[PDB]
Structures are given as C-alpha cells and as structure tokens.
Amino acid sequence: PSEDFVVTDRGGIVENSHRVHAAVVDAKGRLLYALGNPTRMTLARSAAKPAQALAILETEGVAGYGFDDADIALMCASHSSEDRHIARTRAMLSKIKAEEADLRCGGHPSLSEMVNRSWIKQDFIPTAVCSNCSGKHVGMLAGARAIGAGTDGYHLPDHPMQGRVKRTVAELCDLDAGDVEWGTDGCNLPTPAFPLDRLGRIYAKLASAADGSDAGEGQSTRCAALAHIFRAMARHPEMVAGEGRYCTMLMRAFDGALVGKLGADASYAIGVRASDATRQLGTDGALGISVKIEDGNLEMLYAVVTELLERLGIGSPDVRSQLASFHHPQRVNTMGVTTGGVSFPFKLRG
Amino acid sequence: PSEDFVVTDRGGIVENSHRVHAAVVDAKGRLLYALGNPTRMTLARSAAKPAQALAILETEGVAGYGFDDADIALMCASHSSEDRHIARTRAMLSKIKAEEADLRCGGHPSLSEMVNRSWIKQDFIPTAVCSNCSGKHVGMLAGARAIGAGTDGYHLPDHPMQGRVKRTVAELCDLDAGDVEWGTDGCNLPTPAFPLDRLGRIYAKLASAADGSDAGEGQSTRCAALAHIFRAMARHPEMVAGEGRYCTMLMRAFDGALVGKLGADASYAIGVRASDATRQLGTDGALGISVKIEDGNLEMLYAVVTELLERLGIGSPDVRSQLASFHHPQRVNTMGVTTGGVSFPFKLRG
Ligand SMILES: [Zn+2]
Ligand SMILES: [Zn+2]
C-alpha cells in the first residue's frame, strides 16, 4: 500500500496525519491517476445524490410535476437549510400534492455553522423539510406518486423507487448488483458503497453527458438526463450547498467547467468537462475525480480536493485562489498568531 | 509498525478508521503494554498542564499567594468556561493583584456545546478570562510576579517562567532539553512535544507521588507538589473540565483512584494509583497511560480510552458504566434508526 497523507503541523512538529485515497478516471472509468487505494470500498453517502436524482428524473411521469433546474439542484443537494432551501422544499411538496408529514427524513443541526448559530439563538427546532436531503426525499416521493406505487414506504428497499435507485447506481458504476453494498443514511434512505474509483466514474459520465449535450450530439434518454443534472448543479450551486460552502464556492469559481459534491464522512466527487487540462492528463474526453479521507475529516478533505485540482492543472491559479481558505486552512491562535499549517505528503501515481 | 485501529461502520460497511497509539508504563516509565507506536513524537498540548502546574508551584514566592486545591485543579484544566471557571480565574488574578488585561491568552468558543449555546443566545464575546487555559496563564503570571520578573512577557520562550517550564517538562520526562521540541499553543504559550510514552511517564509519576504522600513517606518538595497536583485534580475534577466532559465524568467515576486529562487534537493521559488492577498488570507501583488518535478525532479518543480501561481491568463494570455514552457513541439517524457502530480491532501487546 502507498503512504499518501495530508499532515498538520504546529511549528513544524507533526500534529495530525490523515490517510488519503483518490481516483482520477476517464469517461469510461479507466484509472489515470491514484492516491492510496483507488478501489477502496467506500460509502458514497451524499456524493451518490446525482445518481439518485437520475433515478428520480428517469421515473416516468416525474416531468409532469414541472420541477425546474433549481429543484433538480436541490435533489442533488446537501443544503445548508437556508430559508431559500426550506421554501423550495415546500414548493416542491406543493408541485406533487404531498405534505411534510409524508417525508421519511428528519431534522438535524444545519451543515452551516452560521445558519445553525441563528437557529440556536431563536431556539429553532428543525423539522423534516429542513433536512439537507429534503430535495432528494421530495424527488423520491414524486417518483412514488408518478408510478402509482404508494408513498408511505418510498424509503424502504422493497419500494420500487429504491429498486430503481439500486439498479441505477449499479448501472452508472458498471457493477453487478452484488458488488454494491447498502447501509442506511442519516436521512433514513438506503445508501450505497462501492469501490472509490466508481464514484469517479459516475462524475466522469455526468461531465461526459454535458459535453455531448453542449455539442448537439444525439443522446440517449440517460445521457440527456445526466446532462440536465450537470447543468442544474452548475447553474444553481447555491441549492447544492449554500453560502460559504465548499461545493457552492467551487462550482461558482469554475462557472460550468465542473460539478463537485460532498459525501458525509469526507468523500468528494468532481466531474470535469473536456478541456486543455483533461487533455494534458492523457484523455480526449471528460474526467472524474473521487477522494476519501480515511478518518473522515472534512477540513482535510477540502484542502486535499483543492490541492488535487492544482496538481491536475484544473482551472487557473486565479480560479483556484477563490478556494484558498480551504486549500491552506487558517492556523491562527486566540491571540492572532499563526501556529502551523497543512502539508500534502502524497504523490499522484499514473 | 503495528496496525491498531478504532473503526466506525454503517450497516457493517467501513465508514472511517482511526489509527491508535498508546503506552502503558510503570512508575519509572518502563513500557508494560502498547498500541501502535508507543514512542510516537507527540504534541502533549493540554495534557502537559500538570507538568506546567509543577513549574508554577516550584516557583519561589508562589506558596505566599495561597492558591488552594481548586485553584491548582484550574491550573491543570482545559475548562468549559462555565461561570464558576471564570469566577475562579478572577479570584486567582486577585490573589496575585493582577487584572484580566495582564492575561496573554485569548477567548474562544466554549469546549462545552451547552455553554457555547448560552453564549450564542446572549451574543457573548469570550475574552482572555474565558480561555480554557486561563488557570495555567494566571499561574504563569503568578510565577513571573513571585520572583520579581517582568509580567508583560511571562508567556515568551525567553522569559524565566518559560525557562522553568521547559526544564521542568524535560526533567519529568527524564529527557535532555534537546529531546523536547516546542511550538506555540492556541493560548499563545510554548507547548511541548516528546515521545508519547513519556506523557504516560509524567502521569505515572503523579500517581506514584500520591501513593508516596498517602503512605506518609518523606518526599522531596517536587514529589510532595506532584502529590498535591494529583490530589487537586481528583478532588476538583469539575475544575479540570466541567459538567458532561469526559475528564470530569471519568475522575468522578473513579473517586480518587486515577486522574485523567485531555490533550487537544486527541491525546489523553491517565495516572493510576497502585491497586489490585495495577498489580494484576504486573507492576508493584503506580501506572501511567497515554493515548494519541493519529487523525485527531476526540469522539474516537474517548471511545478508545474507555475500551483500554476495560481491557486493563481498571475500575469495575459498574464504575465504567458511567462512561457508556463515550465508550460506544450513539449512531442513531434523524428518524431514530441505529445505522452503525464503533469497533476496536486493536490488540494490546506486552
Ligand atoms: Zn440523504
Ligand atoms: Zn494552553
């Protein structure tokens, strides 16, 4: 096994070290570059949300509800529970004539410290429409209603909406169903685990579909729906996360060149449209990147993901400098003195 | 290298894994048991506070200020900034005729979520007197004043109070000065790094001194002051951390049998008085334990420390059941469904 780490220091003395796993793949999933174990069996968590949004959009009758691109971005979101996220959740419930009591997700403290601070100040108790996954849950309810399934158990494995998700995830990964494992997420849905490179593969396919659409190429229904998802995420990145959030700031900086999505417990996935940068990396099409920090540290994840974009030449120094606060996280003590930093003793291998 | 981990799962699928280092030492620092690398060079951070309290108590003239056992517990503390912590900081400043403006530490969000909630509700901005290190800083101010040194720079490495700290830390570790490295902490004091087993050695010497004092043995002023520090921490565990904090709950459960202290970025140190448990572990005196979680995760630290006490037979099932919430942290989702767990595949070696 390779020894790929992100390391924090205090005055040059090792504080913490964190093992890094990464895969960089082409549009067919061929491995181009790796850190750590690029095939590590990994819980995709919320980084599977674009695959789940594809299952929702490929459910016949869902188009009749009139979900717009910001609604689709919400289906793809781990949102901050800003007022705009909660309002959009309730508007999406209205489009399908369902209620908050139909949701099978629960409230939680906001993923945004600033939102959560304002909640704590007002003694706000979050409810199901406040879930960071509320968009995905409304989409799954929409799919259940559309096929005339019945809604009470839309979240259970035996429900056709979860059968459709499970098949769709295996298909995008190019895996047999038995090579995908399932647990239960914080939002109370089935959540998949598969080799980390296949999370890269999903995002390479999303960006590849965007390339095919933009170029006016004939597309399958699946390619057209993947291109729609890419467009929705890139056009409404504030729905995918929120103000100050990595995914939002990343996708704003890149202005359509890529989409990126957080997985809880420090996974990350990026889908990169074909560019001079992807060609210099040795592929003629789109690219996928997937990352896992073995110990689950989010601050380290955003630092490593930003470092990998710099290493791979994706964007310009100017575009990437919008993410400087995440790339080289502040180590300023209570008296304003910088006490250390973050280092990246890992080596991309081809 | 040994492969000693604590692991979290979702539905039996690996989520995160965390590398554990631990040393179990006798009263002289002889290694009895280990996990990972027991000599890992480690920033002791707040777990060095008892060594710093010894430097303070050994400073000529400090005895004249009349610091009591709760004051000494606060010198040893990473407190929650409860009102009683702030009050005792102010009382200690008054004993040395100093003001809050003399402190060279800064305010920070409370180490207690409940305290920080009350602060957020009242728009409270924490100041120097609120620092989790405020007791250590008052003690260092006391030392500087007591020997007629300048007070303005009591926190600077060239100040005689910090020369006393540096020498004292190396002496308790049985190390030459050059074998201890120094950085700057969050509170803006010099902070040491030394092999992890020597953190265990410090706490074994604390517990050994307590045993010597209790038995009415003639003691040096250093051994008597180590005994006093142990007794202060054991008698005032609420000063060392606060309500609901691991160190307070651990030391209350053990009712004098041991002292325990958190280091920032997930170190831990325990000093165990001679007992039936220490004798079953193959030593005739007191014992020291030191732990580091390589990636810095606090929840995993408390889980591991509790599991290690169970494996070492320290306490009874009844004593250790007070720590159940830390030993096997809850993995219950937003809908009340248990989605995962914490496992300890590490193996103690002799
Ligand atoms: Zn979810
Ligand atoms: Zn401190």
Residue numbers in the entry:
A (entry chain BBB), B (entry chain AAA): 3 to 352
Q: How did the manuscript describe this experimental structure?
A:
Rhizobium etli, a nitrogen-fixing bacterial symbiont of legume plants, encodes an essential l-asparaginase (ReAV) with no sequence homology to known enzymes with this activity. High-resolution crystal structures of ReAV show indeed a structurally distinct, dimeric enzyme, with some resemblance to glutaminases and β-lactamases. The active site of ReAV, deduced from structural comparisons and confirmed by mutagenesis experiments, contains a highly specific Zn2+ binding site without a catalytic role. There are two Ser-Lys tandems, all connected through a network of H-bonds to the Zn center, and three tightly bound water molecules near Ser48, which clearly indicate the catalytic nucleophile.
The orthorhombic (OP) and monoclinic MP1/MP2 forms show similar packing pattern with solvent content of 49.4–52.6%, whereas the monoclinic form MC, with a significantly different arrangement of the dimers in the unit cell, has 53.2% solvent content. In the close vicinity of the Ser48 hydroxyl, there is a characteristic, almost tetrahedral pattern of three closely-spaced water molecules w2, w3, w4, visible in all crystal structures, except MP2. On the other hand, Ser48 is not always hydrated (structure MP2) or the hydration may be incomplete and even different in the same crystal structure (triclinic crystals, not included in this study). In structure MP2, the side chain of Ser48 has two conformations: one as in the hydrated state but with H-bonds to w1, Lys51, Ser80 and another water molecule (different from w2/w3/w4). The second conformer of Ser48 is rotated ~110° and H-bonded to the N atom of Ala266 and carbonyl oxygen of Leu264. Except for the absence of the w2-w3-w4 water triad, no other structural rearrangements are observed in the vicinity of Ser48. The different hydration state might be the effect of differences in crystal vitrification prior to X-ray data collection. However, in our numerous collection of ReAV structures, we also see cases with incomplete or absent (MP2) water triad. The corresponding crystals were grown at different pH, detergent and salt conditions, which would certainly affect the protonation state of the key lysine residues and, therefore, polarization of Ser48. It can be hypothesized that in the crystal structure with no w2-w3-w4 triad and with double conformation of Ser48 (MP2), the hydroxyl group of Ser48 is not polarized and this structure shows the enzyme in its resting state, between catalytic cycles.
